[PDB]
Structure formats: C-alpha cells, structure tokens
Amino acid sequence: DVNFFDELRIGLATADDIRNWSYGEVKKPETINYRTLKPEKDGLFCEKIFGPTRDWECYCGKYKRVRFKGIICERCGVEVTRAKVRRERMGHIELAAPVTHIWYFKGVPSRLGYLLDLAPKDLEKIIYFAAYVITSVDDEMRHNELSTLEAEMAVEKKAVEDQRDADLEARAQKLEADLAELEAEGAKSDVRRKVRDSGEREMRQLRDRAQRELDRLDEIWNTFTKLAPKQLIVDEVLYRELQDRYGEYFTGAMGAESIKKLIENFDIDAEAESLREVIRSGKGQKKLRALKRLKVVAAFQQSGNSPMGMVLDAVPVIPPELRPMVQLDGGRFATSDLNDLYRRVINRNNRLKRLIDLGAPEIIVNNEKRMLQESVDALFDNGRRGRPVTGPGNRPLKSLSDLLKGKQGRFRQNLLGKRVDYSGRSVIVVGPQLKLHQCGLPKLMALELFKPFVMKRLVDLNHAQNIKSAKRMVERQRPQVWDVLEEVIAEHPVLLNRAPTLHRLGIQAFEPQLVEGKAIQLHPLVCEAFNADFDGDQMAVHLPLSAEAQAEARILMLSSNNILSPASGKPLAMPRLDMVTGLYYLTTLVEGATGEYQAATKDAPEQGVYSSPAEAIMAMDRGALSVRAKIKVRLTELRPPTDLEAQLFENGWKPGDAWTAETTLGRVMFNELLPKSYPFVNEQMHKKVQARIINDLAERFPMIVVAQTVDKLKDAGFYWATRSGVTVSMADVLVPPQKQEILERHEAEADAIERKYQRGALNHTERNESLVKIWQDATEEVGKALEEFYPADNPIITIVKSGATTADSGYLTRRLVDVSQDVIVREHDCETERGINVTLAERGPIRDAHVETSAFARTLATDAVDANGNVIIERGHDLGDPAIDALLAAGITTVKVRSVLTCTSATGVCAMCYGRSMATGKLVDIGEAVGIVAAQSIGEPGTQGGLPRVQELFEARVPRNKAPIADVAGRVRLEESDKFFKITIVPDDGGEEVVYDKLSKRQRLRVIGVLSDGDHVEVGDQLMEGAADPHEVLRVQGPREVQIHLVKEVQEVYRAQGVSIHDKHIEVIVRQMLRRVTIIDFLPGSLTERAEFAAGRPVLMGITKASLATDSWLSAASFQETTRVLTDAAINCRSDKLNGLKENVIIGKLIPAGTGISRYRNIQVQPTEEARAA
Ligand SMILES: [Zn+2]
Ligand SMILES: [Zn+2]
C-alpha cells in the first residue's frame, strides 16, 4: 500500500513458488454443505486454508470476539482475522503426476517444441500418451554386447527364413501332387486354373506373411542400433519388443514426466554454444529454424529461470471470493465456472492416487494421467485444445485465460470502462440563454450529486445538529436545503461528456446552474464538439472532487477555453444553422428599402444620413428605416476599416472620434457585437465570412474575448433568426410543374435517339455521347428555371445561401492510440537543424489549396530570405497566417520547417519541432500528450479510397494493387506486350538498364501530362498510378522519404472527403513506424531502437506490430495477443519500468503527461515574504 513502485517483474512460477504462495492444499472437490451451506473442510472455500467468512470469528466460534487477532483456533484451524483475507489467500493442489502448462506447449510457436527441437505434432503425441519417448540410453553396455546381440538377432532372422522356405515347398509339394492328382481325374481346364490360382495366392499370402516378420525384426535391430535420447516410438509393439529384449540398455516413458526428465538431463550452456556455432554453416531453413530456436534457448540461458517451470508438480488455487459461490436473491444459487474446472482437476488427481495405490495396468493409469493433463489445460485455457469443457446448455466454461484476457467479453469491458461514483446522466435540452461556460443542471441530480457536500453545510449552519439528521433532511428533500445547494454549487465545476467520445472536446467543464425539470440544458454552441443532436440524446455528468481535479476542470477542460478544433485549428464554437441564417439576414442589403439613402439634390438635402446609430433605431421602430436598407450614418464608437482608417486620421483614433460610412443598420449592430478594437467589416455575413472573422479574433485577442464575442453572435443570431421570416409552406417546397413537363420531351428525345440507335443511324459513340447532351439538356433546363422559378427571396434558398445546411473506425483509432500514447513533448527545444521542405502555395504566375494543413502552424528550420532582398522571416518563427501573405510577396516557393519526423529528442518530441498547439493557438506546452490527440484527430473522421486504404497505409501492408517506382534516374523506354507492359529505364550512368518486367494494362501509367516514351525520370518517381510498396521506397529513398510518402497518401484520402487534418498529427503516427532498425546479426536480435543502437537497416512496420514491440509488457498485453505476450515475457523474465501512461492507468499511478510530469508535480507554493505582511 505504498502507491509508488518502480518495476514489475514476471517469471515462470516454479512448483516451490506455488507451494510458498499456498496457505494449504485443497484436498476435496467440495464447495459447501448442502444443509448448513457452510464451507466444507479441506475442500474449496475451506476456511482453514483461505480464510474466515466473518471478521474475527473462527469456524466453530470458540474465538468469536474482536480480540485474538491473528490466532489460529485449535479446534477448527481458522485464523482469527478480517474476512478480507478470503480474497487475498491462495491454495494449491499437489499433483500425483507432472503436467504441462498448455501456454508453453500449445501456444504458437511452441515454446517447448523449439526448446527441445521437437515438432509440435510429435510433442502433442508425447504429453497426451500417444507415443513413447526415449529418456536414457546406456552406450557402453550396448557397444560391448553389440556382437552377441547381432549374432543372436541373425540366428532369429534366419530361423524365420528357414521356416518360410520350408513352408512354401510343402504347399507347392501338395499342390504339385494335388493339382496333378486332380488333373489325372477327368476335369475341366478352368478347374485346374482355379486351384492353381488359389494355390499361387496361398503361397503368396504365406511368403508375404513371413516377409512381414523379417521387416519387423529388421526394424527392431535398426531402431536399437540407432537408439538415441529424444527418439519417439509410436508403434507400441515395437517398443514392447525393445523392453522384453535389451530392456536394461535404454529407458522410455510418456507424458509430462518424460518431458521433465529430458529437461533434467539437458545442458543449456552446452546446447547454447552448439547452436551458436550452427548458424554459420548452412544459410537457409536449417539456420532459420536454428535462429528461431536459439531465441528461446538464449532466454533461458541469460535468465535464472529453470525450464522445469513449464511442467507443474503443483497447481495454484485462486482465492474463493474471486470465484465466489453466492446465494442468489430468490433462493437459487450461482457460482463461478472455475469451481467446476478446479473440481475436474482435483477429482481426477485423487482418483489417480487411488489407481496408483491399488496398482493397475498402465492403460487404466495412463488414461487417468491423460485425463488429468487435460483438466489442467481446461482450467488454464479451456478450448485452446480440442472441444472446450461445457456445462448445461452446451456453453463453454470460463477458464482463467478467458477471465484474465476477457476472452468471454470481459477484456473489452475492462477497457470498455469501469463505473464511477459521483456521476449521473439525463436527456439534454437546448440552453439558448446560457453563457458559454455554463450548463443547466436538474436540481434533483445536483442534489444527489453533491449530497455529501450539502450535508456538511447543512450541519455547520445549525439547521440539523448531527449528520444522521442531515442525511434524512436531504433524502426527504426538505425545503430548507435548496438555499444551501446554491452555496455549495457556486464556482464548483462539473464535467459533461456524451458517448461516443471521439476527440478530447467530447468532455468539457461547465459552471452548474440549478434548473427546473429533469433534463440537462446544454449551451447551443458546444453541440458541434459533442456531435449532440437534440433528438433525445443523453449526457453524463461527473463531479471533480479534489483540488487538483477542480483546477484541471477550471483551467484545462473549461468550455470557454476550448474553442478551436485540436485537429485543424479551425473554430468549432462558431455559430451554426440558426445564428448563421439570422446573421445573414441582419447584414443583408436590400435595394429600395424603407428609409433608403437618397443624395437629395437642389430642393432638399440628403435624406439617407443619420445623426448617430441610436437615431436609426428610432427610425427602425417607426416605419422609417428598414434594418436591411442602404442608409449611411456617422459612428463614434466603432473602428473604421483599415483602408479608410488611414485617410481619415493616420495619427489618432476614434474612441471618441467620429466618422461616416454607408452600411445597413444591421451591419452596424453586427459590428457592435465584435470587440471595440476590431475594424469595421461591412459585409453580408455569409457562412464562410463568420469563419474568417472568428479565426482572426482568436489570433488577435485572448480567449475570454472570443468566448464573449461568440456569445454575442449567438444571441443576435437567434433573435434575428426569428424575425428572419423563414418558414416552409406549400409555395416554397413546391417543385415546378414545368420541370416535369419539360423532361417529357427530354425523355422522349433520349428514347427517340435510342430508337435510331437500333435502326443503324446511331454511329455507335456519338449516339451515346449525344444522349448525355440530351440528359445534359435537362440539367441545363432545371438551371434555366431554378433561380428564375423561385423568387430570389425564398426561405429555402436563404438557408442555402446563408450556409447553415461507427465502431469499425473506432477499432482503428484504438490501435492508433496504443502506438502513440507515450508521445509527449519532453523539452522545449532539441536544437536540431534538420527539417523538411514545404511547397508553400507554388505554381503561381495561385496559393496551394493544402497550405493550411502543411505550412500553417509550423516553425522555420532555416531563415527564409527572398533574393535579392532582405530575409522575409527568421528561423524559428511561428509561421502564422499573417506570415504567409508576408511571405507571398517575396515570391517564395518552398520553406524548410521543423517536424516531429526530424526531431532529435531523446525522449518524446520537443515543442519547437512540434510547433503551435491547434487548441491554444500558441506554442505547444511541455507535457502535452500530442500522440493521443493525434490518434483522435485521425480517428474521429474515420467513421466519417476510404478506411481500408487508410488502414492499409498505417499498417504498412504491401499495396492492394502494387505500383512500381523508379530504381534509378534516366530516360525510359516503353513497350506494349499482349495484355502486359514493359518499362525499361536507361540510366544516365549509364550502367545496367533497369527493366520492370510485366505490368497489367489495367493499372494504367502515371501522369506528369501522361507519361510517354523518352521522358526523364528521377530516383523515386511512381511509374504507374497506384499504391507504391512502402517497403520498396524505404530501401530506395531512405527513411526520411517514406514518412513524406505515407503522410502524402494518408492526407490525400482525408483530403478526398473534405477533412482538414494538420500534417503534424499524421506525422506523429508515422514517426513511430521507423523508430526501430533490424539487426538480427553483431548483435543477438533485430528491431532494436534507433536511439538504443554492428550494422542495422532502417525498418518499416505497422502500428499493430510497432505497438506490440513496446518495452512495456503489460501495455502490450492489454492491447493484443495477451496469451502470447505473457509467455514470451515470463520466459525472458522482463521487468516493466512503468514509464508509459497506459501502465500507470492500470495500477492507479499518475500518468507521465500533463499535470503528471516531474517538473509540474513538484511545484512548491509558498507566499512571498512581501505579501504576508499585508
Ligand atoms: Zn474454532
Ligand atoms: Zn525537435
């Protein structure tokens, strides 16, 4: 209970370790008495072994008081201690015969098979009593008596030969005399042939019968002469022969005990040195099988674990409370399957003792041992071999393997989650009147949620004197407690979350406000992040308790601090669907509106101007001014545009100054919502515009400003969405009757052309092309009507013009997370000069469309200067959007920017290489777990040329349809075989021509225009449109290029669906694929870390393979291939440093990211001496 450890080591549990764990051997397969329902002595649940059922009470009760702690009762053998030990103490079962641990024997690849060099099929026949095996052979005695045995054996083989030849002549003698005697008597020719045919077969059968024994004897002599330990005999009559004669030279057995003997007479070191020598002689299958086999042999040599652990002499029994036997409510009983699996083991084990003691033919005994062997396999991993053990209803029993994994739908649930106190949920309803940092909380829910809190305040203010009175006071919902609730709730944040949780914005903090009703009121702007429809969705509420937790909610997870998508940097809390149309209408400009500005001439002065913005309101309330009119007024509090601001002042400003411009009264009221410092906009507030303006604000103003500014756009957006006058009815939804009639000629002409196609006037391609012209004619016709058909001021069009309008992908996101979770910023700067080139909106006489996801939010590796001229931007600059335009003037077409691919940080990555945090808009903060955020940023749209191609890339699999890349630079010769293509590259060396043999015409050539014969080609160009083998480009272009390629492919898929993911997210995932280099040979094994590293090569491997290769063994176990990881980890005897965050989550430690880093969890908070005086 120290809560802070360092390592976690695993190793094969020996028979002694098991005996040391156990608190007593369970001897009987008895659960509990059928009458008293008390635990039966010496059986499962035995209180003597595992512990008491009641705290400080022995079984008989002689010592039933709270005293006598840790004293064993001399009548029932029960220790006097808390009943909790009934969940910590184990038992054991002493096996009358050894047994194999199914994990090391059957788990692929066979650990025992590779350890003793026995094929798995052969090994299976040994442990399950299908064939004998030679344990020991005495050479010297055999060699000395070899002569006599040979002589005696020859005599025997001859005696058979003398008999065989002597028998055949007798039958032939009879037939010779018999057939002739029958021939003497009148008989048909066929009769003689039948007898002779029978006689010939009779002889044939007789010689072959003697030949059989000759081959048998020969096999006996050969098998004896070449007898050697580890040999296997399946005949069982041959073996019987070897025992009756020559029985003193050799020894053989079956089952686990023979396997145990071979391990006893086994020299790892002796063997370990032979196989090390064996690797050099024959390269191929022999050395390969030796290479694989040595890994296990070396693991046993380096570690102190005895390979004897693979065969158990004792079996551990899990505590009872984890396999509990419980009396169900309603009279029935329920119990774990382990008890029936343990029952099989102990039942058969005891019967064996019986059989052994009685003395029984080996068949009966061996049959019992095999049964015992199988019962332990079922106990550990049921069904792993043969038909699984089934109970009633033919359902397989839950083995230990199943319950550790979760093989019966338990693992998923463990990472499906664990439940938590101080929580609740309910259906959500819209909260249009809430501030962004607030949420509506049903009073009842907030009551039960804060129950403990309001209880203390209810007692302190002496409404009730004792705590018991406070509990009943809240339980009965006394009217006095509602005043104490607002006091405990004040400035106490809560966490809202809606499943499924895709990105980190799926959980946010809010200021709880007590509300009437049983529904949660959610702010309307956060619907985007939660993907929360109001069709009846429910949301969960959690209550942060500790100071650190509350602070994390106020600072890290607060609603108004998280506005920008942590994937694209785009704003999410930006208005949508209602406020868009409302703001669109407010700012729109209508010609000839009431009060329209008119520059009156020669009879009166202009009538469109107005004294101040307030006056226009009085003209709008009266019928004088339409908010959407083109009037002009003089504003004294808004800031003028940039271009017009220079002409007017250029030296001072207009906090109290005035100025005139012509805009809609609405466009005025709109700009009032923005900050005072922001320049006037004066535009129809299109959907796209609001994104621009909101983006700009995030860069120029703090968060609180944008939060309050978006709050003001919500109110205005809604208010004018109601006065918008947008409703559906018969007229608007009506589809034009003329469109249906015009298509009749459209459909008759497309069909009339089909009647001419059959006649022979079709011309076979123009006809098909002409039909498209007909079909295209209707498309043109609908456009000819569409805007003219429905009045420009149509509410359906206005909604369009304004812009207002599963687990398979989450399966991929899980592998993404598990491969990148340990990637966190660990230092501000690694100081590396390396970087990568960005195209930066090239091809101009023109900005690249993908600059926002490749160049935005980066940092320069080298200064950017435009020659001839001054340096445009200094290295290490943030490369904001304003910087791009400044860079655009210089005419630059490439930029070097730092990246996590080139970062040299020993641990994790550095801030400067990572760059700007998408959520904060500033430099990324040390400790940010950019890996998890990256996996989410990629996984979320996964549910949204699709997921198979993306999964094909991240898993590093050979492309579905392979496409060749250029192996060397030079010109290209193109040839066309029948149904094939040949592509020869004539190098500029010019050396050996590179020929790409056979290429399906179905997978046509790539494009520059389309490639032709004789074009120049570089060292990495893709020759045909398709997916190039990532392992191919790796060996060709090197690690730095494979990353550039993969990112280009992944981002192209997401770009195809209109998803904006910044490259750095994808890069974080790719970086983890090239971290290891294969050695396998100057070193023992391949795939050591690049930093860990006698020549090795750069390696490309999938996320699933890369994540399973992590140094933590319990992280790889909770991920995939559970049984496999433990077996290899137990053998190697690995120790986990508990460095990654997954591990700490399991044991309950602080994750080494965010508020858990060393630098951040050791802050000392003391008040300055200067402040205390006050
Ligand atoms: Zn007792
Ligand atoms: Zn770096």
Task: Supply the DSSP string of 454-465, one letter for each residue.
Answer: HHHHHHHTTTSS
What is d(CA 1120, CA 1107) in angstroms, rounded to the nearest whole number?
9
Q: How far is the CA of 1061 from the centre of ligand 2 (A)?
A: 21
Task: Count Cα neighbours of 983 within 13 Å in the Cβ-side half-sphere.
Answer: 27
3-state secondary structure of 639: strand
What is d(CA 273, CA 1128) in angstroms, rounded to the nearest whole number?
22
What is d(CA 1089, CA 1110) in angstroms, rounded to the nearest whole number?
10
Q: What is the dihedral of CA 159, 162, 163, 165, to 10 degrees?
A: 150
Q: Which ligand lies nearest to the CA atom of residue 60 in the structure?
A: 1
Look up tokens 């947008």; give the residue. Answer: 726
Q: How far is the CA of 854 from the centre of ligand 2 (A)?
A: 17
316 membership: H or E segment, kind and range: strand 311-317
What is d(CA 31, CA 40) in angstroms, rounded to the nearest whole number?
6
The CATH superfamily holding the domain 578-723 is RNA polymerase Rpb1, domain 3 (1.10.274.100)
3-state secondary structure of 554: helix
Q: How far is the CA of 48 from the centre of ligand 1 (A)?
A: 10
Backbone angles phi, psi at 625, to 5 degrees: -120, 130
DSSP β-ladder status, 825-827 and 909-910: parallel
For residue 913, say whether it is annotated as part of any ligand binding site.
Answer: yes
User: SS3 for 294-308, per residue?
Assistant: HHHHHHHHHCCCCHH
Q: 844 to each of 840, 841, 865, 891, how far by Cα in Å? A: 11, 8, 18, 9
For residue 73, say whether it is annotated as part of any ligand binding site.
Answer: yes
What's the chain's length in residues? 1174
Q: Which ligand lies nearest to the CA atom of residue 74 in the structure?
A: 1
- Residue 909 token pair: 């990555």
For residue 537, say whether it is annotated as part of any ligand binding site.
Answer: yes
Q: 116 to each of 110, 265, 271, 377, 1124, how far by Cα in Å? A: 10, 11, 10, 21, 19
For residue 910, say whether it is annotated as part of any ligand binding site.
Answer: yes
CA angle 499, 502, 504 (to 5 degrees): 105
Q: Where are the alpha helices (DSSP H) in 108-237?
A: 111-116, 120-127, 139-144, 146-184, 189-225
What is d(CA 27, CA 50) in angstroms, rounded to the nearest whole number?
13
Q: Which ligand lies nearest to the CA atom of residue 826 in the structure?
A: 2
What is d(CA 584, CA 578) in angstroms, rounded to the nearest whole number?
10
Residues contacting 650, CB < 8 A, separation 6+: none
Q: Which ligand lies nearest to the CA atom of residue 75 in the structure?
A: 1
Q: Where are the alpha helices (DSSP H) in 461-598?
A: 467-475, 481-489, 527-530, 547-551, 579-587
CA end-to-end span of the chain: 43
Q: 1091 to each of 411, 1076, 1141, how far by Cα in Å? A: 34, 8, 21
Residues contacting 372, CB < 8 A, separation 6+: 95, 96, 97, 99, 345, 348, 349, 352
Contact 670, 583 (CB under 8 A): yes
Q: How far is the CA of 55 from the centre of ligand 1 (A)?
A: 13
Q: How far is the CA of 903 from the centre of ligand 2 (A)?
A: 3
Q: How far is the CA of 57 from the centre of ligand 1 (A)?
A: 8
DSSP 772: H
Q: How far is the CA of 713 from the centre of ligand 2 (A)?
A: 40
What is d(CA 800, CA 789) in angstroms, rounded to the nearest whole number?
16
Backbone angles phi, psi at 794, to 5 degrees: -100, 130
DSSP 242: H
For residue 46, say whether it is annotated as part of any ligand binding site.
Answer: no
Residue among 460, 561, 565 at smallest CA distance from 511: 561
Contact 89, 23 (CB under 8 A): yes
3-state secondary structure of 245: coil
Residues contacting 520, CB < 8 A, separation 6+: 426, 427, 428, 429, 439, 440, 441, 442, 445, 496, 539, 541
Q: Which ligand lies nearest to the CA atom of residue 859 in the structure?
A: 2
Residue among 448, 549, 519 at smallest CA distance from 489: 448
824 Ramachandran zone, left/alpha/beta (phi>0; psi -120 to 50): beta
Q: 419 to each of 378, 526, 869, 1119, how far by Cα in Å? A: 31, 25, 64, 21
What is d(CA 410, CA 403) in angstroms, rounded to the nearest whole number?
7
What is d(CA 117, CA 110) in angstroms, rounded to the nearest whole number?
10
DSSP 313: E
Q: For residue 517, count other CB atoms closer than 10 A to its CB.
A: 13
**What letters, b where the CB count within 10 A reaches 16 and e where it falls short, cover 214-242?**
eeebeebbebbeebebeebbeeeeebebb
3-state secondary structure of 469: helix
Residue among 538, 498, 496, 493 at smallest CA distance from 513: 493
Residue among 101, 342, 362, 136 at smallest CA distance from 231: 136
**What letters, b where the CB count within 10 A reaches 16 and e where it falls short, cover 476-493?**
eeeeebeebbeebbeebb
Contact 1068, 930 (CB under 8 A): yes
Tell me the helix, strand and coil percentages in the chain, rounded to 5. 45, 15, 45
Q: How far is the CA of 71 from the centre of ligand 1 (A)?
A: 10
Q: How far is the CA of 1012 from the centre of ligand 2 (A)?
A: 42
Q: For residue 1064, count other CB atoms closer than 10 A to its CB.
A: 27
3-state secondary structure of 438: strand
Q: What is the dihedral of CA 542, 545, 551, 556, to 10 degrees?
A: -20
Tell me which residues have their CB within 5 A of the ion that is ligand 1: 58, 60, 62, 73, 75-76
Q: How far is the CA of 1091 from the centre of ligand 2 (A)?
A: 14
Contact 800, 577 (CB under 8 A): no
Task: Count Cα neighbours of 717 within 13 Å in the Cβ-side half-sphere.
Answer: 24
Q: Which ligand lies nearest to the CA atom of residue 79 in the structure?
A: 1
Q: How far is the CA of 13 from the centre of ligand 2 (A)?
A: 44
Contact 959, 1029 (CB under 8 A): yes
1148 Ramachandran zone, left/alpha/beta (phi>0; psi -120 to 50): left
Method: X-ray
Residues contacting 278, CB < 8 A, separation 6+: 286, 287, 290
Largest interatomic CA distance in the chain = 161
Contact 553, 559 (CB under 8 A): no
Q: 81 to each of 52, 53, 58, how far by Cα in Å? A: 7, 10, 9
What is d(CA 780, CA 768) in angstroms, rounded to the nearest whole number?
18
Q: How far is the CA of 923 from the centre of ligand 2 (A)?
A: 13
Backbone angles phi, psi at 721, to 5 degrees: -65, -25
3-state secondary structure of 643: helix
Q: How far is the CA of 1120 from the centre of ligand 1 (A)?
A: 48
Q: For residue 1103, count other CB atoms closer than 10 A to its CB.
A: 24
Contacts within 8 Å (CB) and 24+ apart, 1140-1146: 1140/821, 1140/822, 1140/1110, 1140/1112, 1140/1115, 1141/821, 1141/822, 1141/929, 1142/818, 1142/821, 1142/822, 1142/1112, 1142/1114, 1142/1115, 1142/1118, 1143/8, 1143/1112, 1143/1114, 1143/1115, 1146/1114, 1146/1118
CA angle 218, 223, 225 (to 5 degrees): 95
Q: How far is the CA of 1092 from the centre of ligand 1 (A)?
A: 60
Contact 804, 690 (CB under 8 A): no
Residues contacting 309, CB < 8 A, separation 6+: 12, 13, 14, 15, 101
Q: For residue 1069, count other CB atoms closer than 10 A to its CB.
A: 26
What is d(CA 229, CA 263) in angstroms, rounded to the nearest whole number?
12
As beta bridge partners, residue 827 has 910
Q: How far is the CA of 139 from the centre of ligand 1 (A)?
A: 61
Q: How far is the CA of 239 from the centre of ligand 1 (A)?
A: 56
Contact 97, 257 (CB under 8 A): yes
Contacts within 8 Å (CB) and 24+ apart, 975-983: 976/1001, 981/1005, 983/1023
3-state secondary structure of 730: helix
For residue 533, say whether it is annotated as part of any ligand binding site.
Answer: yes
What is d(CA 639, CA 1021) in angstroms, rounded to the nearest whole number?
54
Contact 362, 300 (CB under 8 A): no
Backbone angles phi, psi at 312, to 5 degrees: -90, 135
- Residue 216 token pair: 């048998």
Q: Which ligand lies nearest to the CA atom of residue 61 in the structure?
A: 1
For residue 830, say whether it is annotated as part of any ligand binding site.
Answer: yes
Q: How far is the CA of 72 from the centre of ligand 1 (A)?
A: 8
Q: 1102 to each of 100, 814, 1046, 1050, how far by Cα in Å? A: 35, 14, 12, 14
What is d(CA 681, CA 94) in angstroms, rounded to the nearest whole number?
86
User: SS3 for 57-109, per residue?
Assistant: CCCCCCCCCCCCCCCECCCCCCECCCHHHHHCCCEEEEEEEEEECHHHHHCCC
Q: Which ligand lies nearest to the CA atom of residue 924 in the structure?
A: 2
- Residue 210 token pair: 């003697």
What is d(CA 1022, CA 825) in angstroms, rounded to the nearest whole number?
35
Look up tokens 């195809």; give the residue. Answer: 1056
What is d(CA 1093, CA 1129) in angstroms, rounded to the nearest whole number?
22
Task: Count Cα neighbours of 743 within 13 Å in the Cβ-side half-sphere.
Answer: 10
DSSP 555: I
What is d(CA 477, CA 483) in angstroms, rounded to the nearest whole number?
12
What is d(CA 609, CA 957) in angstroms, rounded to the nearest whole number?
70
Q: How far is the CA of 1077 from the centre of ligand 2 (A)?
A: 20
Task: List the chain gaps (C–N > 2.5 A) by preceding residue.
Answer: 805, 845, 944, 1008, 1081, 1093
Q: How far is the CA of 914 from the centre of ligand 2 (A)?
A: 7
Q: What is the dihedral of CA 991, 995, 996, 999, to 10 degrees?
A: 150
Contact 300, 268 (CB under 8 A): yes
Residues contacting 867, CB < 8 A, separation 6+: none
Q: How far is the CA of 1059 from the centre of ligand 2 (A)?
A: 27
DSSP-assigned states of every residue in 1040-1100:
HHHHHHHHHHHHHHHHHTT----HHHHHHHHHTTSSEEE-----S-S-EETTT----EE--
The letter for the amino acid at 1119 is F
Q: Where are the alpha helices (DSSP H) in 535-641?
A: 547-551, 579-587, 613-621
Q: Where are the alpha helices (DSSP H) in 226-337?
A: 238-244, 255-264, 268-281, 285-302
Q: How far is the CA of 54 from the centre of ligand 1 (A)?
A: 12
3-state secondary structure of 21: helix
Backbone angles phi, psi at 510, to 5 degrees: -145, 155
Contact 7, 1135 (CB under 8 A): yes
What is d(CA 114, CA 1119) in angstroms, rounded to the nearest whole number?
26
Q: Which ligand lies nearest to the CA atom of residue 52 in the structure?
A: 1
Residue among 1074, 1110, 1077 at smallest CA distance from 1095: 1077
Residue among 674, 671, 676 at smallest CA distance from 657: 676
For residue 535, say whether it is annotated as part of any ligand binding site.
Answer: yes
Q: Where are the alpha helices (DSSP H) in 684-842?
A: 687-700, 703-722, 730-733, 737-759, 766-789, 795-802, 807-820
400 membership: H or E segment, kind and range: helix 400-405
Q: Which ligand lies nearest to the CA atom of residue 861 in the structure?
A: 2
Q: Which ligand lies nearest to the CA atom of residue 897 in the structure?
A: 2
What is d(CA 1124, CA 541) in angstroms, rounded to the nearest whole number?
39
Contact 873, 858 (CB under 8 A): no
Residue among 153, 274, 287, 165 at smallest CA distance from 224: 153
Residue among 493, 917, 508, 980 at smallest CA distance from 698: 917
Q: How far is the CA of 917 from the centre of ligand 2 (A)?
A: 15
Q: Where are the alpha helices (DSSP H) in 893-946?
A: 911-914, 930-943
The letter for the amino acid at 474 is V
